[model samples]
Target: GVPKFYRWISERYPCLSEVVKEHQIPEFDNLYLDMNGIIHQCSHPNDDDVHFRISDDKIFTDIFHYLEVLFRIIKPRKVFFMAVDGVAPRAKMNQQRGRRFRSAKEAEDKIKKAIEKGETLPTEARFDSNCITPGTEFMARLHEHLKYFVNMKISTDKSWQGVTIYFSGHETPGEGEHKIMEFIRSEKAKPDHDPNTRHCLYGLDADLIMLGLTSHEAHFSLLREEVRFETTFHLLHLSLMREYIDYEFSVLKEKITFKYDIERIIDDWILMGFLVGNDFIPHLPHLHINHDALPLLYGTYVTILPELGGYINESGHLNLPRFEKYLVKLSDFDREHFSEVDLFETEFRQYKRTYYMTKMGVDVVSDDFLADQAACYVQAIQWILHYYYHGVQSWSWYYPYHYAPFLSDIHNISTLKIHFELGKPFKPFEQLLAVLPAASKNLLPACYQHLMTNEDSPIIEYYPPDFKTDLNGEWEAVVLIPFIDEKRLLEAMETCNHSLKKEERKRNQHSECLMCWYDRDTEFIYPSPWPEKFPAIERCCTRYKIISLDAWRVDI
Candidate 1:
């Protein structure tokens, strides 16, 4: 017996649940280890005197001990790690060094001075041979910590339960190949005797690990997870190459040769496509890489052509057609914002109308605009993502897994459940679709192409209703008047009219009568009771008769 809004809202809860399930936070009880194949030889990027260094053996032991300590304190359920180079050999010797100061104290003094000058120290010398030693007691301590210092166990049968561990390190095909093979064999050979055991392990056994030297390259690889890691590294190199071209083009912008370089970029994109081959998934960079102008490419277009459509246009708006045109202008990077709508349409057509209805006015929309406002909702979600991630001046990291459609559905499932449940009883959803515009629906693909190309699209043809033939027929305007309380209406008029007169009088000496100002025929509209025996005057033409008519027709 919930209110209509509440019931609709409750139905959508399931959708929210689905979304949550899709992008639920991964279990963190597991361990993770990451190692950079490239090491800082002399000093870290900050505080040069302290000296920074790391070796393969030292990195592994350090992560193990850290996880052991964490397990003792916060018993996680699973451990996940990235072993880029399984059992990679440690670096042997280091003679080269960069000196910044005579002593640690001098370095500190310089750091203070740099801080005062608004230039923070960029190098730190912290790691030395002592910490990099392979046989350090740290490894033993880590093992002890895992055994006695922590409860590294949890119930694993429940789907929601379990901790995970992850490790990533550099590995060459030969140096660590045997060790990785052994590790994989051991994992595969482990007995799964317990039939009830739900815990599992999985990973890729690979050789040759490449680490990014620059932050930008690393970032690009991280964002382009759709491609394999090796492909991603190559893609980064390609991006760097493109950046060099861009730099050269910037210098040439003032000269007429700019057009030549622009052509070069486009040609390069085409050549790159040929080199990379198109069989792979089309990553954004791959699509636009060789092109001279990166800003003009629109990724993908989808059209929704109805089987029957008369093009829903009303109130000076050309229905969804114009709105779709607007979407093409949106920034390409911002396209992920509509991923949710695209997903919903494909997966949940049955509940689409109900879902759209609830969301209509939830974001400050007028009631009359709700039916045809799905496109606006899609754009609104896009705006939220853009503002939350890129627009606002604040500290918020943009995580695509959370901002995209799959996650969104989980977040709004509760509201969706309500929408579905109540709307089921009314059957408004089916009725709405049943009465869609009557047209031979086929221009959908064309419409989608138009949005992508931003070109003039052909007018989508439709059959006009038979009633259109009577365009010059007589037309009738029907005004529905509600029964009014005469006594209340007269009282309100008298009060409002009198208040205006008092205000005018307070403003002082006006020759213009305030009472008659609002209406020139005030006396006719509201006749006053005069002194006894005063002569009466007729306000309107004596021949005129006031008659009430129920219906009237006008010639068109």
Candidate 2:
């Protein structure tokens, strides 16, 4: 359902996971929730059967129950950070645009076909997942609901007791995981901070592994539900992954004349993982995880490390000359890889050329364009290195092309004049204009909705009813749509934004700091706050008061 790096690593380092148990777990100082996953799982927990409708009350309580379960299990002593993804960086916003637009297209056709075949369904309004975006009234209320939930828990079982229960919602800028990392990074800089304070982050994404590794925190671990293996939670110890990497690269010791640094190696390994796949950047065309890309990258790194004086990555920055050496060897894999197939040498060359000319919309496959693409790709890797190891180095930097250049073209990457601009993130309404499909325009303010649907709307070209995938055949096929022109889109939003009501316009704005609140300005109470006809989630505690979200069960 997700990327192969997670499954690949799970299988490669079998010891990385331990089926978890209560009291058997290590004491953790912090538990961070990648809250979007939980929100989607709880809110509309659905089947493809086309009739499952979820209520607002049910969705809210389901989320509370899920959080309750996590707190009960992890029992983190110092902090509980629940981070809902806010307005994403421009790079991530592009990827989200593709998925949301494609989903809208498919869902329209899916429901049409289902009804024509004579299935019955409810008349109630279906939950549009696009509402999970920041600034929507849905997220606005959910943020309030979450604040209430945290305060109530603090008042009660209150083992939320001495804990710093942080509630970073959509009102905050940056992603849930990134915001959590930002918090962790800030804490690490303090003189009083504990290096050994354990961290457990909850998510089912590929990058969590990379994030955990880059923390350089020895006590970092990941927790996820493993429904495929069993109806239970699994703890992925980053410490175990570190141990595996040590054993993985142990062969390098005999070959190299230099002293090895595994901590340094981790930063390099994380860069290679990004080349395979990630949310922001395009994965290298040659490096498919299923194609044993990790094995290829690892072996190449082992072979090349001896030749270079130092590691390819020094902390967050890239040693470009050293990286090029490693890359030149990796390019050798292209020929060896092609040799395994039926295609001849000339055909393989033509194929790479065609990949650029045809797929990437290039009229000429000149060395200039090829190297430029390769150079941008190199720049992207450097940017990503900074992103994972440090906080975002540049919010505006993004790869314009969807396709990655071949390794052979990555020549003289060291010559690139790399620079970055710390451009601000898009405002919530501006991001909504960028990512929301026309069908989901209701999530926007009345004035903003017209930009997507009105016939005379200046930005009508951005919202296409349907789009075609240029490559791959999976559900996540690359849906070829125009990248949002940031300038033009923002101009429209600002010009039209004056038409919004005070509260609606407030939702259109971005936050100066992570916004937070609760019952009448932080006063603590509950049950009275809950909706009528809603089951008392706290009263039952476990008597099935809230709908137990079993989203992964859909696979069965």
List the global CA lDDT of all models: 0.24, 0.76
Instruction: Write model 2 residue lDDT over 179-249, tens digit each, in one string.
Output: 77777787787799988889999865678888888898988988876552114667788988998998898
Please list the residue runs of candidate 1 whose C-alpha ends up more than 4 Å from where it truly belongs after superposition: 1-130, 146-181, 188-556
Candidate 1 lDDT over 1-556, as tens digits, reads 2222122212422221111121232232322222222122211334443333454345433543544432333223433332322211111000000011012234455567767777744364433322211112332222222222111111112221233322222211111222222222233345953222221111111111111111112111111112211111111122333354455334434433224343333232222122111111111211223333232321211121121132211211223442233233322333344444466555543243343344221343333333224333333332222221122111111111101121122121112211101011111111111111222111111212221122332211111121111111112111111112223323323332333334322321211100001122223321212213122333311111111111111111
Candidate 2 lDDT for residue 115: 89
Winning candidate number (lDDT): 2
Task: Give the total clashing residue pairs for model 2.
Answer: 1
Off by over 4 Å in 2: 1-3, 228-231, 340-346, 454-456, 470-475, 512-556
